Write a protein that binds this ligand. Structure first.
Ligand SMILES: [N-]=[N+]=NCC(=O)N[C@@H]1O[C@H](CO)[C@@H](O)[C@H](O)[C@H]1O
Ligand SMILES: [N-]=[N+]=NCC(=O)N[C@@H]1O[C@H](CO)[C@@H](O)[C@H](O)[C@H]1O
Ligand SMILES: *Cc1c(COP(=O)(O)O)cnc(C)c1O
Ligand SMILES: *Cc1c(COP(=O)(O)O)cnc(C)c1O
Lengths: 810, 810
């Protein structure tokens, strides 16, 4: 069909068809008379999987022979989403499979919609790990993703009566064809117990044991025949566990609950014991695997030369004291040598500045669960503070500020301080974020060891976020500059010479229109809701959180509605405002925000005077597969977090690559995006970080804005009087109260600027040709945001390895 | 290698080898350099499994086209044991696979030992269901086995310090290649709730729902290309289950615990709620499947003509009221018509007479868990007793004796009475057992409906219990009468004309010697224990229970030991006494019996004066796979239950078919075995049922025997004084107390006869030629005990279907 989807050769199509029938028969044990679409999906999945296996085995054999430095990416989240199409794309099998299934009388797109998303993540942090795995494989790095195989990933969101309802994400129900259980590599993990100081060294004894069973999933690089591994651990009790008889067998669930479910919090720390167990479980099993592989390649001096451990935030921070425990207690190395090895091996990536998101574990928890690790942490703190004391003599406050141990109500361990002390590199995820780290929260550490602090701006993989979800756009681009950009996104800059090309301008706009029509159809298919494909698609999709300010978006929507009602027969650019995202189960304000959105839609979408000029839809169950559908159809990307709160953001990059213009604050990566495309091609508004600080020093008083802005006052009064909740007049009292008295995110402060800049957006949309030309300038300069660039920087500046675009024999 | 194992054709061996390599690569994702024996086992299992799939699909398609009457065998136990060799035997692939693996440089026997036993049963009852499935497939019946897929089967037994230790049987750890999950056929099962009487009929509402997910396993017939299905249900919570968030997800285990573990009791009733849930779970899911299949073949008048439901004991007895519930509450049939259909559809098999083994569920349990079913049961009882009252006017005691509702401390429901009332056929499992049922426990019911009572003597499958476990014997037999006997065991009667054949006599004895050498080697391999292959192998393997009297065996062993010590230089036939079997976790006396056995061995096996003349070994973890090894190596089979307690026994039949002579009481099937072979060819001893009754009427006084038998007195005094437990002198006080004051099984009463008859056994063993000739007479007359004969009788006399030996196109 289309070029970038590969060749549909005669021999391969014939081969695919026969293997498809083979699997349907021998693997699924069915015939064409009783097979359902799901059976067909699995037959295709197994057929494609077969093509991975040869490459997977020789890739790993290759690494064994050449023995390069290995990269271990530890994360408690891997937001992978579907795997079928991604595998076909990276293996250049899309057109062949499309043809083969066509000839079998099946629609491949229909079958792809059957696969369940692998939702082992909450949002940005988890998706970043997924994009990174793709880029590491595409760049030929010997990398391994290590995490937990949650039985239940992020919950499926249902909207009932305008409220969010959560239901278990039983994603393994029908089986997972992509994973390979490896029970032969099961390892033991220890919990509780006591420390016993003998003659030679300490010993951790009387522990409870939980087995870690690994499951391997292949990670194919883009058409380079490289297939890396993502290994996820599953908790299993030992057979002598708790061994009345029946009850002992039933209580095995206690131990296996460790890998049962993903904590659904985005940028929020919940200090629960079960979570601490998950964190140590991944770290303990992973490190034994690392050391095992290392020994099978005695003198750990070369350990840092053959191993790199990247901590995705502080979730796997226990790797630092666990590595020390193993080297000191088990391998018998002296502390100083063990510490040298640990520091040179570990690197830490920070993903936030919000105080409530930082991990601070109560000492009493670590004391009971990991007694030996708490002793090691105290020792580390002792030696670190001695260093601080020697560098800043007499500065006693610095000592208490930098301590890994925080005093107070309950003593806690600051895991971020632990990570900085035990890593040779610490990085932020966007230029502005990394600078904030050095200027504020980690200022003392930067002054002690400036060389440790770096920046590695985030990115997204152009395979899943362009070729896979937007083939039409990838095609018109390839037609004019070739296919090389798919693994070298900087080449999109060549599109700049087509900004005045009438043909290209028309094609770009046509692809967008087709995407909007397709999405507009999808909305009626699976959700039954009519929308106007000619309107401007204004979308904000991301987790629901006060700092992301979906509330500011709501204020604008209500403003537009009030203006229409004020002058009904005045022309306004038609808009379809789409807002989607999940709220953490226990985050009350976030759940109220969702109710507000649907409540607004209930009024706006049924007002005869508005017509098809304004629609407000809440996108249900936003997840990776839904993102792949709505982002390609968007015109406006909403990235409006309060300056200084969104560390980077990645959804912003996805929209830029897919042809949407961006309205946002100078926050996170938005700053670098505007810098790359030129501020005149971005819709920037609001306070900058410096303005927010000025406001805080002075004291934020929402009342001031309410008194000076009539339109804003009207909105607040509508919310307060029950205009959007007739039956429950005070339903939104909490929202109004927060907005008026304790809004940590200054929604009102950016209201005027936001509405004004939204007017400029509507003005440009009225001129199709100029809107598209600006779009072209955005797509053309989005190259820097490829995760291939990000990973190459990690490789060269942190891991000490060189990326390679060399193909392996297939 | 050997004839009965099929042909090793050139084309097939080549084909097997390539498919083996294909699976090792694509399925297991390994290469010959990192593959372990387990990987090879799985590659072979998948290769053999492939050969089943074509036959499995066309068999089921066949039944759909011809639409014969279908047989549903409901059981909460299916003791299947390994599946690899059995599949090869039934598909005539054994020699080809043997050759193919040989050429690949692998020992197939070594790989077979890697497979885990499917131990979803306790003993005889569970194994019977397994043999029955094999015979039903071999006889071409459209039969389905329905049960529960326990995550943990019968526990693995470890012997520590002479005591039994139980450890979880995590048989699914490495995966099960034989099963096929069928999540698409998942059905809902209801629990708790309340009954609501409306205008038209009652309704069961406010129930808790648990999903039943089926897993299908193929059951191949013997070389007839028929492959039936065994469907096992697995418990799964609904995704909206219990839907803080985390806890709700974790509490899903509550619902899924239903299929977690098999209750480890043999002939013992434990009235636990979890067990009741398992029983209803299987019944509810199975009946919906049956009705669904029936409708897809409106007027249930033909239901009994297209459906037969066989209840394996009372465990699935709720099928009777559940069928009524569905027909009356859901289908809206009138009671009388519904009852007529139910009775004609259901048949019940009783497997015991021990009072403690009969199911009597507390009304308060059924009341809370299955409110609608308890109402239906009361109604059934009401109508049944009205029938009794009309047939036996004025007989008020009969009314209370026959009631399904038992009064007393706590009201209970007698499930056996429920089954008789709601079934058109009730059978015992051995002639003597069936007669006892009519004369004692079910006397009142027999007088009311004599036509319902039948007998169906048990049997074993000659495929697993001869060809599979004893190829050497199957071969020498085939050499002289062909292979037709494998599916027509009555032909073994032709061997009678070889009883005087010197060549045959020599071959029979040679096969036994080889089996003993092989087993003697196995004992040193996996368990490290030296034994003399020239001694008489005296074995008693079966579950540990007081009625089976392993204690009587112990008394004989100690007697032999005391006699040797008395006259050290006197000649005695060397013996290796082997006793094995598991004890239910909560059965204290049974666990003490095991300790006694090992304690005896500790003294006997280390006494210099005894030498290699007497050895006492306790066979650890007796299970199906171990049975296949020890039975072919046995010389003496111990079947010494107190007359009237062993309903049938099946281990007795396995020994007879494999060349061992039998020493036993006239109990269960032993009576028919002696009748078939001739009493002169059996070692029968002890009280008959009539003698036991005489003793009970008079009053059993163990003291009498103790006073009149010096050798017995000496033994009891040795046990009491600590002779077998030096460090713990009163360790066996409970055993002595029971034996002397409350032995329900009269161990002492049969002691003298037993020892005397054991002397006759030793006398015959001294004459190899005559011992073997008697063996030949046993093997030659064991034909009646084939489960093919048993199933043909069930088919013709109960289910109303004709068995077929016709091959299906392959
Ligand atoms: N742990 N924890 N929570 C922190 C977290 O999710 N951070 C997110 O990281 C992603 C990936 O670095 C950023 O793009 C988001 O801006 C940032 O909020
Ligand atoms: N439920 N329950 N327990 C009863 C039971 O296991 N019965 C056994 O059945 C098997 C199979 O009918 C008989 O051979 C045994 O003699 C008998 O004890
Ligand atoms: C890209 C992505 C995110 C991150 O979006 P931001 O706007 O940066 O928070 C979250 N969820 C999903 C499903 C995504 O694909
Ligand atoms: C045949 C068998 C039984 C039944 O033996 P009996 O002596 O009749 O009780 C029990 N367990 C296993 C493993 C068997 O193979």
């Amino acid at each position: 069909q289309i070029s970038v989807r590969g060749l549909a050769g005669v021999e391969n199509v014939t081969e695919l068809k026969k293997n498809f029938n083979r699997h349907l028969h021998f693997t699924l044990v069915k015939d064409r008379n009783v097979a359902t679409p799901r059976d067909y999906y699995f037959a295709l999945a197994h057929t494609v999987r077969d093509h991975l296996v040869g490459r997977w085995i020789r890739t790993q054999q290759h690494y064994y022979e050449k023995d390069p430095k290995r990269i271990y990416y530890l994360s408690l989240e891997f937001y992978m989403g579907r795997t079928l199409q991604n595998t076909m794309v990276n293996l250049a099998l899309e057109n062949a499979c499309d043809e083969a299934t066509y000839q079998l009388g099946l629609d491949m797109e229909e079958l792809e919609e059957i696969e369940e998303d692998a939702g082992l993540g909450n949002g940005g942090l988890g998706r970043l790990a997924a994009c990174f795995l793709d880029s590491m494989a595409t760049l030929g790095l010997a990398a391994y993703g290590y995490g937990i195989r949650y039985e239940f990933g992020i919950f499926n969101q249902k909207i009932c009566g305008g409220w969010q309802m959560e239901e278990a994400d039983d994603w393994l129900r029908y089986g997972n064809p992509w994973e390979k259980a490896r029970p032969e590599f099961t390892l033991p993990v220890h919990f509780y117990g006591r420390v016993e100081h003998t003659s030679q060294g300490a010993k951790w004894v009387d522990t409870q044991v939980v087995l870690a069973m690994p499951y391997d999933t292949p990670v194919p690089g883009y058409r380079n025949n490289v297939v890396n591994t993502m290994r996820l651990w599953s908790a299993k009790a030992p057979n002598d566990f708790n061994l009345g008889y029946i009850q002992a067998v039933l209580d095995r669930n206690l131990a296996e609950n460790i890998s049962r479910v993903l904590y659904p919090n985005d940028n929020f720390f919940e200090g629960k014991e079960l979570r601490l167990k998950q964190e140590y479980f991944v770290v303990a099993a992973t490190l034994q695997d690392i050391i095992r592989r290392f020994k099978s390649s005695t003198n750990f001096d070369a350990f840092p030369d053959k191993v790199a451990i990247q901590l995705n935030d502080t979730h796997p921070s226990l790797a630092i004291p666990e590595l020390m425990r193993v080297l000191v207690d088990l391998e018998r190395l002296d502390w100083d040598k063990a510490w040298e090895v640990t520091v040179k091996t570990c690197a830490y990536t920070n993903h936030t500045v919000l105080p409530e998101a930082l991990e601070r574990w109560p000492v009493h928890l670590l004391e009971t669960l990991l007694p030996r690790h708490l002793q090691i942490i105290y020792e580390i703190n002792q030696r670190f503070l001695n260093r601080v004391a020697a560098a800043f003599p007499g500065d006693v406050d610095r000592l208490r500020r930098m301590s890994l141990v925080e005093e107070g109500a309950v003593k806690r361990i600051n895991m971020a301080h632990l990570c900085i002390a035990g890593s040779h590199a610490v990085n932020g995820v966007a230029r502005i974020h990394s600078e904030i780290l050095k200027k504020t929260i980690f200022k003392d550490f930067y002054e002690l060891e400036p060389h440790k602090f770096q920046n590695k701006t985030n990115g997204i993989t152009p395979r899943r976020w362009l070729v896979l979800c937007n083939p039409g756009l990838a095609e018109i681009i390839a037609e004019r500059i070739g296919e090389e950009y798919i693994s070298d996104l900087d080449q999109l800059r060549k599109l700049l010479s087509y900004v005045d090309d009438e043909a290209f301008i028309r094609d770009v706009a046509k692809v967008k229109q087709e995407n909007k029509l397709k999405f507009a159809a999808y909305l009626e298919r699976e959700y039954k809701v009519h929308i106007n494909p000619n309107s401007l698609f204004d979308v904000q999709v991301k987790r629901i959180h006060e700092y992301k300010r979906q509330l500011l978006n709501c204020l604008h929507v209500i403003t537009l509605y009030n203006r229409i009602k004020k002058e009904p027969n005045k022309f306004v650019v038609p808009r379809t405002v789409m807002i989607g995202g999940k709220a953490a189960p226990g985050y009350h304000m976030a759940k109220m925000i969702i109710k507000l959105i649907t409540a607004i839609g209930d009024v706006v979408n049924h007002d005869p005077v508005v017509g098809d000029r304004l629609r407000v839809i809440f996108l249900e169950n936003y997840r990776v597969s839904l993102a792949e559908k709505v982002i390609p159809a968007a015109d406006l990307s909403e990235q409006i977090s309060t300056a200084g709160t969104e560390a980077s953001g990645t959804g912003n990059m996805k929209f830029m690559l897919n042809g949407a213009l961006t309205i946002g604050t100078m926050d996170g990566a938005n700053v670098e995006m505007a810098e790359e495309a030129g501020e005149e091609n971005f819709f920037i508004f609001g306070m900058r970080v410096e303005d927010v600080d000025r406001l805080d020093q002075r004291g934020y008083n929402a009342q001031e804005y309410y008194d000076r802005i009539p339109e804003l006052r009207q909105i607040i009064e509508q919310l307060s009087s029950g205009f959007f909740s007739p039956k429950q007049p005070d339903l939104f009292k909490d929202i109004v109260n927060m907005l008026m008295h304790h809004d940590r995110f200054k929604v009102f402060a950016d209201y005027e600027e936001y509405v004004k800049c939204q007017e400029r957006v509507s003005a440009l949309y009225k001129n199709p040709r100029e809107w598209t030309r600006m779009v072209i300038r955005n797509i053309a300069t989005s190259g820097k945001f490829s995760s291939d660039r990000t990973i190459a920087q990690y490789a060269r500046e942190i891991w000490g390895v060189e990326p390679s675009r060399q193909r392996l024999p297939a």
